[PDB]
């Protein structure tokens, strides 16, 4: 907790760097997660689901 604070939080330069890197990771992972979820709730309905017929 001290260690974590000292490395990532104490210096604002490090805090902002950590926040931005997390935002990058979140953005990429959230994209992928929503894509999969959206495809499961709308299964068999989307073009990608019928495309194989044509």
């Amino acid at each position: 907790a001290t260690t974590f604070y000292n490395v990532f939080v104490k210096r604002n330069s490090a805090f902002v760097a950590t926040i931005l890197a997390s935002a990058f990771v979140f953005d990429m992972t959230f994209e992928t997660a929503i894509d999969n979820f959206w495809d499961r709730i709308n299964a068999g309905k989307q073009w990608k689901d019928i495309r194989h017929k044509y």
Partner: protein, 59 residues
């Protein structure tokens, strides 16, 4: 009521672990998460919005 050295009761609000790094770190985790979603939200907003200026489908 009269003496100003008798501090009012703050026991309903005081945390026991108020001076610990864990205590501070928690609040910075909240601030940091909020900054993280604001950064990710701003990035998405800017990217999607400015893309209007790239060649439209008809071009």
């Amino acid at each position: 009521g009269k003496s100003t050295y008798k501090i009012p009761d703050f026991t309903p609000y005081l945390k026991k672990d108020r001076n610990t790094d864990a205590n501070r770190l928690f609040s910075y985790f909240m601030i940091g998460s909020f900054g993280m979603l604001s950064a990710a939200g701003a990035k998405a907003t800017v990217q999607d919005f400015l893309s209007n200026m790239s060649a439209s489908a008809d071009v």
